[PDB]
Amino acid sequence: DNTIHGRIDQVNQLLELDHQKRGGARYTALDKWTNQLNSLNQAVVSKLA
Amino acid sequence: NQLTSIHADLCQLCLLAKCFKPALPYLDVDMMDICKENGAYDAKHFLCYYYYGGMIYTGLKNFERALYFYEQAITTPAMAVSHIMLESYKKYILVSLILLGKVQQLPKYTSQIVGRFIKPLSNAYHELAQVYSTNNPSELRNLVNKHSETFTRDNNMGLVKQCLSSLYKKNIQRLTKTFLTLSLQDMASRVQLSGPQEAEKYVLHMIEDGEIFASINQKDGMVSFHDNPEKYNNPAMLHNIDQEMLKCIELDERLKAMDQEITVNPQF
Amino acid sequence: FSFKKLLDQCENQELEAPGGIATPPVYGQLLALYLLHNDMNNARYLWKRIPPAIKSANSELGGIWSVGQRIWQRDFPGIYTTINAHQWSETVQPIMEALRDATRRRAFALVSQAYTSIIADDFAAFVGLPVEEAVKGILEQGWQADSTTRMVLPRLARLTDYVAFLEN
Amino acid sequence: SIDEIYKYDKKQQQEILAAKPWTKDHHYFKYCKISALALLKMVMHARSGGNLEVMGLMLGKVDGETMIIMDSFALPVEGTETRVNAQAAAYEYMAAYIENAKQVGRLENAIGWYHSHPGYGCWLSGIDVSTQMLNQQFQEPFVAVVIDPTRTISAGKVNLGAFRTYPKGYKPPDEGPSEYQTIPLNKIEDFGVHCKQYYALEVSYFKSSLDRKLLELLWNKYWVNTLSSSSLLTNADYTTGQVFDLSEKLEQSEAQLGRGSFMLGLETHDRKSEDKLAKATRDSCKTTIEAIHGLMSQVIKDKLFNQINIS
Amino acid sequence: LIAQHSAIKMLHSRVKLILEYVKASEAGEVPFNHEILREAYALCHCLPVLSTDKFKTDFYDQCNDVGLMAYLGTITKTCNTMNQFVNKFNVLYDRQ
Amino acid sequence: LEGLISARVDSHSKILYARDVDQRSTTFEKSLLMGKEFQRRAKAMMLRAAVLRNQIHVKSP
Amino acid sequence: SSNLLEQFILLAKGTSGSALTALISQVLEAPGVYVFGELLELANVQELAEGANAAYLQLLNLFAYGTYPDYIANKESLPELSTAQQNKLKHLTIVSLASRMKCIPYSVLLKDLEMRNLRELEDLIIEAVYTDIIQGKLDQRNQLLEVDFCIGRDIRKKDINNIVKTLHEWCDGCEAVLLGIEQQVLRANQYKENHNRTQQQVEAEVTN
């Protein structure tokens, strides 16, 4: 339901709660940017003859 | 370095009398524009230089340059069939079966001839690629004896053998993705190596190659996978990205001189 | 260092000097030089270029190719026995000296990455010296040996060019 | 000259106002000279807003293709990035100020308005262009000015552009590029359409004896803090935002070039979405230049201080 | 870069007045002192401003991001001239 | 492999662990790889443009 | 301190001998003192040296040029210290270690100060930081002290050459940095100049 944030370690009886966040927002925007450049190069070079 | 027909013939001499080493600085350089003014050149020379240059690089086990060399022998414009075009295609399927898990893409500026004529011409190879996608070596093995006479007459024997070892490498490497720790006995049954001793032998070959990051536990009779060459915060990675930028800035500069050249020419 | 130059002068020499089949010592050094780089494909291809005439004429050459058949299998203990099998004075020895030390390093290096744990008897084959000599060495380097079971555990200038480029 | 510039001439304005050349061409002007006073007052007032927008007025004159900005004064008015013609509320305060100003001996007519865009660059928005376009009819002469008071502290360079916009249904020329100071995620679009509608004018100055120097000497001590801008964290939000939007543009480009603009014996003419890659490359430059500029603030520290160690 | 330049030039001038003072108190012309020398001594010692293991990776992490950012921009620029080259070529040497 | 569950089995003692994905490792590797193939296609294009401009294609005569 | 120093010099200069002997024991006890330059340089203290009160300057010396390990070493020859005098020297050892390394690990601090544990040690650095004579923070993760700031006491007039060398290294590299930036700005400019040149040059010929 996501009213508790994290996951469980049942072989030690712990909650590995999540506060393991950092940024992420920069890193995912660079991935979206990075995937369009592959499709764009493929598209442009393929127009030649 | 401008590319012309003496380049093809250099590779031919090396191919017959093995001593691939002198030819390599010519090959390892990529270029734009052929040597012209007064003839002395045609599309067959272009195709044969790249066919052979692929042949040599696969041999060195430089699968990266081979793939690229092989591709240039397919992308060439043609409206007629030739013996080099069949061979170039067939060698391409075998190489892409090593590098990739199925055949690697071809652009849409490929010649018409490679689709229309060459594909029913290369049926056997399409069946190699199909069996490889099932991911079962026993079947791939049986197919190679069925298809054998073709392999010999076309003389891309021995390469066809590599595609079989590369499936076993793929089959080991997919397990890495899935498992942290797996047994050698377990690896051996599933991969169909059929001997844990060989499981240990196969990863150890790959450790030296650097296709795998792993460690062997012979107390437990396990393999432990690592997988951590880069954390991406190394200055080593910064320098590598910085080196890659210098390449791009020069590549763009070639394009500027060539775009400008068309700007001087009057448009149609 | 010295060896790299020695391949360069020899590589030149193969094409330039003969009528197409060069003399037996030149081929031997060259073959031996390819094994030090561990460029085994070109080595193998070297032997396949070699006619039956040189194989009868020269047996030393055929020993150098035998180490190399094993390097292809990558079976260590086998490598060592072949190093001892043949010697040819002057013409093979300085490069041979290097071959023996290049495979031992390759072997220690290989093991250090390859195994988080290894049997001491298998390790003895890799370095190629017996159990007493090996267990004595590992301790100094700082690798752990377990005894009883006998197992061994290995252990601005760029930026301005780029800004200048994007602004233009 | 140096003293000829300081005196104001009522007659030169009376001739100019009758003549009215601007009706012919609104791209007419080309240079600016702004007083040392005008500039310092404009930065301080802008800075007093904080990261919140403020407007002020400028008194000046024109002489040929030069605009001259003699003095400036602040207004306590709210409506910079919302209210179209916010200045109206200000009118009563302006009428006071000009009357007070004439009697001490400053007779120079209003040349234009200044406002500021804090933390998003020097450019005119949808509110700003719409308010300028009324002013170029009614108010003349009237010029827009923009300054950023936070960005400026890092770079050390005064970003001040005095601009004027073109009236409706006027075809722009090929006058594209200008200074690259990044915009936020939703403001990117707004710049994109409006930029060709206006141009910036080049600026000159002059100097003498009470304000400049407290600052000049203070910088001699002060210099350390500008090199600890350290932008990459301060405005971290900018990179993620522009880069996710730049991705949406590349999707637009894949389709635009891919299918092609539908045309039947008609060829594209000036548009702000004409030749998508050619536009797009520049958007990559405004985001890249700021990023490496961030790296250069870091690089200086690392070489200057950290390499000294203890010998 | 102008601010950055001038900033170095201020540090050149700051080093210079402290340095000539310390020498002057040894040499003669200024007398010996404790209060000012103890402080100048202390000023030298602080350098370099961090060396910890903790700083190094976070410093590189930001440098590495701005290294990718720059790489993805130089490709976009190159793509543009490639699309322009390919457009002009097809019209002239082919029929497009 | 086929699905999205980023997890690894420790089949030694039978515990299902515990793969943390890293948004950084996947973007950086991709950007570098993507950069190699972009350059290679550009080189491939120069070679395509080179035979077209000086007008050779494969012919049976 | 500030105020207390201005009183003590005058008082030292005022009297001789038997009172001066007394004054040394008082300066070291008196709080807020983490300097011991000025009193040593006066002529008045100097008379007691080479006699039966020489040991008081010899200790004062040991505080001034030296530290807690230099003290213990000749604990027999020099007269006693009280808790305030010892605690002041112990803080004054940290400044010295800080002169060599910016970050100093616990095992170094621990040895030199001869302290019973980490927590007693960590209490002394917090007390210093409140008086603000040293500024710095504890890292219990890497087991270091990472100092923000520290101030002398340290006359050390033989060793002073080191300070001049570092000041000098700080100098020479500056110019090496300026010729640096000057180069880049001209290189940026050189690129834009050529780029403008080539485009304008190419465009003209289209007209023919």
Short mmCIF file of C-alpha atoms in Angstrom, two decimals, chain C residues 4-138:
data_model
loop_
_atom_site.label_atom_id
_atom_site.label_comp_id
_atom_site.label_asym_id
_atom_site.label_seq_id
_atom_site.Cartn_x
_atom_site.Cartn_y
_atom_site.Cartn_z
CA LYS C 4 59.48 -5.26 -27.99
CA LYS C 5 62.24 -3.74 -30.17
CA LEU C 6 63.45 -7.32 -31.04
CA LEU C 7 60.00 -8.16 -32.42
CA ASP C 8 60.08 -4.95 -34.46
CA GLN C 9 63.41 -5.63 -36.22
CA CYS C 10 62.43 -9.34 -36.72
CA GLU C 11 58.93 -8.49 -38.15
CA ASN C 12 60.57 -6.30 -40.78
CA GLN C 13 63.16 -8.93 -41.48
CA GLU C 14 60.53 -11.70 -42.32
CA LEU C 15 59.10 -9.89 -45.33
CA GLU C 16 62.33 -8.12 -46.50
CA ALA C 17 65.07 -10.77 -46.45
CA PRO C 18 64.08 -14.11 -47.96
CA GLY C 19 62.70 -15.34 -51.31
CA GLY C 20 59.50 -16.15 -49.44
CA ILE C 21 60.75 -18.86 -47.09
CA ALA C 22 63.22 -17.46 -44.57
CA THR C 23 65.94 -19.36 -42.73
CA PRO C 24 65.32 -21.47 -39.58
CA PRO C 25 66.73 -19.29 -36.66
CA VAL C 26 64.72 -16.18 -37.69
CA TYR C 27 61.41 -18.05 -37.55
CA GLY C 28 62.29 -19.52 -34.19
CA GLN C 29 62.96 -16.10 -32.43
CA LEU C 30 59.87 -14.67 -34.03
CA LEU C 31 57.64 -17.51 -32.81
CA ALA C 32 59.10 -17.24 -29.33
CA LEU C 33 58.53 -13.42 -29.37
CA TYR C 34 54.83 -13.95 -30.19
CA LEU C 35 54.37 -16.19 -27.02
CA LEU C 36 55.83 -13.35 -24.68
CA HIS C 37 53.03 -10.88 -25.91
CA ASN C 38 50.63 -13.82 -25.56
CA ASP C 39 49.41 -13.20 -29.08
CA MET C 40 48.72 -16.97 -29.58
CA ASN C 41 46.53 -16.68 -32.71
CA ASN C 42 49.39 -15.07 -34.79
CA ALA C 43 51.74 -17.75 -33.23
CA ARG C 44 49.56 -20.57 -34.39
CA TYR C 45 49.19 -19.01 -37.81
CA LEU C 46 52.99 -18.60 -37.87
CA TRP C 47 53.44 -22.40 -37.44
CA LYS C 48 50.75 -23.06 -40.20
CA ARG C 49 52.68 -20.83 -42.67
CA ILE C 50 55.86 -22.95 -41.85
CA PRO C 51 56.42 -25.65 -44.47
CA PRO C 52 57.35 -29.34 -43.79
CA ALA C 53 60.90 -28.40 -44.85
CA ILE C 54 61.63 -26.28 -41.68
CA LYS C 55 59.99 -28.95 -39.39
CA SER C 56 62.50 -31.62 -40.50
CA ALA C 57 65.34 -29.09 -40.62
CA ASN C 58 64.71 -27.59 -37.16
CA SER C 59 63.28 -29.42 -34.09
CA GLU C 60 63.71 -26.47 -31.66
CA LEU C 61 60.98 -24.58 -33.45
CA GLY C 62 58.66 -27.46 -32.90
CA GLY C 63 59.34 -27.31 -29.17
CA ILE C 64 58.53 -23.62 -29.04
CA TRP C 65 55.15 -24.46 -30.77
CA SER C 66 54.46 -27.19 -28.23
CA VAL C 67 54.40 -24.80 -25.20
CA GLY C 68 52.03 -22.81 -27.21
CA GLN C 69 49.56 -25.70 -27.99
CA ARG C 70 49.09 -25.89 -24.15
CA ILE C 71 48.71 -22.13 -23.72
CA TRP C 72 45.69 -22.50 -26.04
CA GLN C 73 44.27 -25.26 -23.67
CA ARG C 74 45.46 -22.97 -20.64
CA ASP C 75 46.75 -25.92 -18.58
CA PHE C 76 49.56 -24.75 -16.40
CA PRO C 77 51.51 -27.76 -15.16
CA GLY C 78 51.93 -28.82 -18.78
CA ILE C 79 53.47 -25.47 -19.76
CA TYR C 80 56.30 -25.89 -17.25
CA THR C 81 57.41 -29.41 -18.36
CA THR C 82 57.70 -28.11 -22.01
CA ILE C 83 59.82 -25.04 -20.94
CA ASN C 84 62.36 -27.65 -19.55
CA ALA C 85 62.16 -29.92 -22.58
CA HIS C 86 64.13 -27.78 -25.03
CA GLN C 87 66.82 -25.20 -25.00
CA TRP C 88 68.76 -23.72 -27.74
CA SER C 89 71.60 -21.59 -26.65
CA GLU C 90 71.83 -17.75 -27.42
CA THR C 91 69.40 -17.80 -30.32
CA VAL C 92 66.48 -19.04 -27.98
CA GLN C 93 67.74 -18.29 -24.28
CA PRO C 94 67.16 -14.49 -23.53
CA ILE C 95 63.59 -14.67 -24.87
CA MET C 96 63.02 -18.07 -23.15
CA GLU C 97 64.00 -16.60 -19.79
CA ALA C 98 61.19 -14.03 -20.31
CA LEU C 99 58.62 -16.75 -21.40
CA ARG C 100 59.06 -18.71 -18.24
CA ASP C 101 58.59 -15.58 -15.96
CA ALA C 102 55.63 -14.19 -18.15
CA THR C 103 53.64 -17.49 -17.65
CA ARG C 104 54.33 -17.53 -13.75
CA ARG C 105 53.16 -14.00 -13.39
CA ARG C 106 50.11 -14.77 -15.60
CA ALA C 107 49.45 -17.74 -13.28
CA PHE C 108 49.73 -15.98 -9.91
CA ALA C 109 47.74 -13.04 -11.30
CA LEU C 110 45.12 -15.37 -12.67
CA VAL C 111 44.67 -17.21 -9.41
CA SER C 112 44.50 -13.93 -7.33
CA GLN C 113 41.42 -12.79 -9.25
CA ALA C 114 39.98 -16.19 -10.07
CA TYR C 115 39.61 -17.95 -6.79
CA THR C 116 38.40 -16.56 -3.41
CA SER C 117 39.49 -20.11 -2.19
CA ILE C 118 41.76 -22.77 -3.83
CA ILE C 119 43.35 -26.12 -2.89
CA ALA C 120 47.18 -25.70 -2.17
CA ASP C 121 48.08 -28.82 -4.43
CA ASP C 122 46.28 -27.14 -7.45
CA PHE C 123 48.13 -23.90 -6.64
CA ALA C 124 51.35 -25.85 -6.65
CA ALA C 125 50.72 -26.71 -10.31
CA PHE C 126 50.05 -23.06 -11.23
CA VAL C 127 53.22 -21.48 -9.92
CA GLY C 128 54.89 -24.80 -10.70
CA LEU C 129 56.98 -25.19 -7.48
CA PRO C 130 56.16 -27.78 -4.80
CA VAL C 131 53.97 -27.50 -1.75
CA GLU C 132 56.78 -26.54 0.79
CA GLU C 133 58.15 -23.82 -1.42
CA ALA C 134 54.61 -22.34 -2.16
CA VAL C 135 53.13 -22.29 1.39
CA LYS C 136 56.38 -20.47 2.53
CA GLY C 137 55.84 -17.77 -0.19
CA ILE C 138 52.10 -17.03 0.19
#
